[PDB]
Design a protein around this nucleic acid. Structure first.
Lengths: 158, 75
RNA sequence: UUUUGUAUAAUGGGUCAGCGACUUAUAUUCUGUAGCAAGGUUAACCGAAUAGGGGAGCCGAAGGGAAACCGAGUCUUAACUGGGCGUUAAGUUGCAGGGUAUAGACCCGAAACCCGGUGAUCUAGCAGGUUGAAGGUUGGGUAACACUAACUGGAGGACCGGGGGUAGGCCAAUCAAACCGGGAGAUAGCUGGUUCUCCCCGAAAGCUAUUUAGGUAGCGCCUCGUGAAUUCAUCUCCGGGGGUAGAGCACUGUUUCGGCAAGGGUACCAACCCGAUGCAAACUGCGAAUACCGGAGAAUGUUAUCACGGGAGACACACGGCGGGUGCUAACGUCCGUCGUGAAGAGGGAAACAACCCAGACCGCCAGCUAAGGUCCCAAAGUCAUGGUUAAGUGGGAAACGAUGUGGGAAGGCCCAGACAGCCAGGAUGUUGGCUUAGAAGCAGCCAUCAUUUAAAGAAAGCGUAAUAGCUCACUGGUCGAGUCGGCCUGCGCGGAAGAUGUAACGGGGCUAAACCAUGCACCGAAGCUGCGGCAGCGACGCUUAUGCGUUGUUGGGUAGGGGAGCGUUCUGUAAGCCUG
RNA sequence: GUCUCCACCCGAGACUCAGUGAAAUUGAACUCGCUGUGAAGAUGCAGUGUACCCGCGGCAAGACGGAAAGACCCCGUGAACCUUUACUAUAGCUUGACACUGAACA
RNA sequence: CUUUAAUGUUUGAUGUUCUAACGUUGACCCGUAAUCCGGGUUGCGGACAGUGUCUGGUGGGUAGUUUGACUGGGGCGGUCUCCUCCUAAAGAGUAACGGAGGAGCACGAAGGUUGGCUAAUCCUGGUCGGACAUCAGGAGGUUAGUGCAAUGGCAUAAGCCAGCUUGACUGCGAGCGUGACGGCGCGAGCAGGUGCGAAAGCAGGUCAUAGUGAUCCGGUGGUUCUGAAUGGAAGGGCCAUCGCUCAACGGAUAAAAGGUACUCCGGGGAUAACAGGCUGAUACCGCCCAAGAGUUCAUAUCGACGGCGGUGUUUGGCACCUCGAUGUCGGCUCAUCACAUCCUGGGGCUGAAGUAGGUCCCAAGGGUAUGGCUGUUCGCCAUUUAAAGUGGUACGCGAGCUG
RNA sequence: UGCCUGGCGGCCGUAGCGCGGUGGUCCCACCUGACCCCAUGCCGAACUCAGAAGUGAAACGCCGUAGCGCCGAUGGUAGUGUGGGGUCUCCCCAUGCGAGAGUAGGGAACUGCCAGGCAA
């Protein structure tokens, strides 16, 4: 006995994977081990639009029903992991910059702890300049400089 | 769990005896072969009985197993 | 008004006078009517102009195919005996009307969205503390700075108990967002209303689908118009086929009896099976009654039948009966196939009660007949008759049970060789028993359940004694004696049948027959029928041929809905006419 | 009854918008009590009983009393609210290229 | 031209210096007794920062939306397409959150023709082998098998064996059944050419009934069909095929998750939180059977197992009127009424020598407390008396009062 | 015209099965060989090729056997359409139809055409 609800959920997952691989770019498709027929179908789906695109995606899912998906899932998982790592690094940099702009010495302490080589005097000067810019509605030049400095520190650490 | 009912296949006798029918008409719609074909009567792939000529329908018992056969008389 | 179903204690309205609810524009489809007629027709514009000019333009007279292309024929095919679509009917302009789509679109009743402002003299806001960098101060440092250890001011906008600014909190004391002018009279599968009259016809709450269940499109059904055949319906005859009731186990299952009894662990469980027993909506070697349609037939039914076009409504049905699914064979629970009722019909009777019984209203008459139901009165008729039943208010509630309440049916035994019961008498003695000896001796029990006198007495049935004892009864003599006992069918009754606003489970009076069983006579008893008169739709025959009918028969309950026919008022020409101080 | 341990009165704080000569209310009333039924609990239905007509002061068994198109609950391919790793997009963010943006040099 | 390079040209990148653009909320002077702004000089960085377009994700901080339908209150559970049997009441068809189930395959053969053949249910004999492996005979005649789960029928076998083949072909197809329709199924026969067969004949798929997805749109091949001045090309149309768990399967978007008891609007007794009546599985009271207990003895008292009367006081079903409103459970006063009587009076029975009593009939005229425990209806404990009885009346009365 | 035989049809269990008798005169079978036509998932087992030596074992045709299966009345009964009634989850009344099984009875099939031996 196989539950039709489980079958429908599996079909939805397969269609989601098909849509994700279709959205993936040329480099991602090349990296992912896709057979010739599946690759041609994906390219045709990308070329077409409207309800035709969704029905081609449904065809892709139907093919995936029989074709193995574990290598495709692994490739998608690793690509998404890399992308999420990059996005998390960017979010951490933005949050650190925001904390530096808001609090001050409290965020400077965390910056120094994360990167001992960071210059306390330079960070304090940049934070003061950012506060002055906020007060005088000046462009966030200090904020951009702080972001660049944090990016350089992260690159040096890595 | 139960309750799934299929729509009826419209089974039964469509043309009865003593009535004039045209060629190609369907006499009986049956799954099996309750009634067999006789003179001027044909049986399709799906056990569909049809008349090969215009006439009146008739029923007759024949065969070692006493099976009912349908025939057409040119009346 | 919503609900199938309303005064119901489901909605609503105080009255009066006035105001008010499908109009109008743009295109399309159809009906009536007028001209022209293979033509009709104008628009803008000109126009001393509602005339005339203006044929620009629009529609059919020939279409097929997507098109090329072909043509009274064309389209897929090499093309069909082919099949799809054309000719053998004539289109147009106006008017009036029935619908469709867009504009407010029959009208009223929302929240809410966007645009520009009135915004703060009420209120939320400079209340207050805190988070808190900014300034200063003191303190280490430094020539002096930065930084840091503590104090102060408080940014910030907030944290805390008018599309914004600042506890449905506030910005007119119901503002996580008011009002004004506009989109916008926004939209609403929703509530409510939709105003004069007459006549004819007059259904449904059903099937298919729905991001779809109270709604909608098609079908089902209703109305109006056109055309068409014993067209259709009841019934008689003829042709069929079911697997339903019934019956049954040929086959598939199911419970048991006795077995053959594999297998299982031989006093013990048991498969495939045998004959019977019942049962099966998911079994039919058999198989109905009904019903289905097809061919013929006299009769009747205003063609009650079918196809097309315009217009609808409806698309929540409930009760009863019939055979059922589910619920506990319980419903006024729910779902199925069919008829009736109501929805769409009041009537008379059941006291009142939609679904219970009789019965389909054209109107009028101070006439009679009649259906169901009644005839003692309320309240109209029998205080009716014939042969019976009831002693209990049974009738006028209720069931298993028990029964000398009562009248019969089949009968059994005993019966003047005097039946049962009465009136006078016996029921003596071992049987103080071996047995549990405690005394049970028959009267609680293992126990024989015997044995002389016998018209007659048991080794024992009750009352009665610690057991004895004593009084009755099994049976027996004297007198009378004729009927006596138990069970069933039993119809009518008895207790089971006791509850709360005040009798109340016959309507009451009140009935011992004025209650029940079967029959008759007649009577009462409806808007049913007939007797007379009057109005209207309908097919015809005899005129009239547009309207009167000599007339015949027939119909006239009606929601929604459809069709037909009319009245009231304002204004315009009729109307510089008519009435009118 | 000093006071506790609080509770009750005689007079104030704390807070508390009846007022016109009105009011909710009205389909119309010659507006009785019980029994049975009734879209199910009867002033109005069938049966039965009571009661001279109308005022004045009290009681409150009823007229499903009035004050809120439920303050209970649900429905709406209705609205609004907020939440997001629900869909579609945006403010801001950062990557590099293109002109503002150069001149000498290795 | 791959592999080479002094020499003449081009920009790209790294690194150093300068500033002439740029920034200067750096200073000084002037309009200006002017903290704004503008005109000039200078220092500091300087082609950097930023500026406008594109390019990447982050993105509810922000804007527009969504989260289907059915259900014994609701939530929750479960279903959304096709087919077989009964429900489904003997034409046909027929629903329910009914009872049993299967399917979204597969076969180039398991299809066609032609020519032939026919199992079990059991016994008999035989090495493994015995109830059942295979062999020979016998009652046997489809109950075997008929690819699937099932229905029918299949002996003329539609079941099994064997030579050859792709008619599972091409354009149709009068007519018939079905459905509102789309559409689906059958279908004699016409034109071409094929497979089997000497032929009458069959082959337009599987012995039939489930194996399915219409429309719009995309790829593939053709079609000069058209091809917007000409000739082309491009683009559009026609045919055949490949494309959807579009499983919400007649298929509203290619694209959507929670609640708001902070809520508003319109509606709902189609539908609830409470109330009458219709209902009666269950529960309560009484009784028959009542084995037997009660020294013994069925009824002084119980009385196993079943059975029968009254109650609706809880669990059981419609809401038939109540969302244009029925404010629920406690308490205070008023309670009338039925006796199935707490005692109070008249009484019968015994295991009633008397108080005491246990049981049962009539009797409603009389009354039937106070404190701890809970807001509670209800329920337990203590002290007196004759007792501190039960019920319904909207689980009474907030139009009598108290939250 | 009859006893019979082979083939083709109707009815197709009253028609079919168990028992005894009868037949090789026509027709039917077994049988010799199959090396040659053909055939076995091995085999002349089956089919087939030239014969008929011999017989009727078995089959096949006819008669009797009612023994079985089967058909089959009449009546009754269950049931059922119509209207009504009752102590209405059931039954009865008037009416129309009407069962199944069993029962009387039947039953060893009958019938049309063509071709052949015998007697006519």
């Amino acid at each position: 006995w196989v539950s039709k609800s489980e079958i429908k959920r599996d079909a939805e997952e397969l269609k989601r994977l098909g849509a994700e691989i279709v959205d993936l770019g040329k480099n991602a498709l090349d990296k992912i081990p896709l057979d010739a027929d599946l690759r041609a179908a994906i390219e045709l789906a990308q070329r077409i639009k409207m309800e035709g695109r969704r029905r081609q995606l449904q065809l892709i899912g139907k093919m995936l029903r029989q074709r193995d998906v574990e290598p495709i899932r692994q490739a998608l998982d690793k690509l998404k992991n890399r992308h999420n790592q990059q996005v998390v690094l960017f979010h951490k940099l933005e949050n650190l910059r925001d904390r530096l702009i808001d609090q001050g010495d409290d965020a400077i302490a965390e910056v120094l702890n994360l990167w001992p080589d960071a210059d306390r005097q330079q960070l304090r000067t940049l934070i003061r300049n950012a506060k002055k810019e906020k007060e005088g509605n000046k462009p966030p030049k200090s904020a951009r400089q702080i972001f660049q400095y944090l990016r350089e520190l992260a690159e040096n650490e890595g | 769990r139960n309750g799934r009912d299929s729509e009826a296949k419209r089974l039964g006798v469509k043309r009865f005896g003593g009535e004039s029918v045209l060629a190609g008409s369907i006499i009986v719609r049956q799954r099996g072969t309750k009634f067999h074909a006789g003179a001027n009567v044909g049986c399709g792939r799906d056990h569909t009985l049809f008349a090969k000529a215009d006439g009146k329908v008739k029923f007759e018992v024949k065969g070692p197993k006493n099976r009912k056969f349908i025939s057409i008389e040119a009346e």
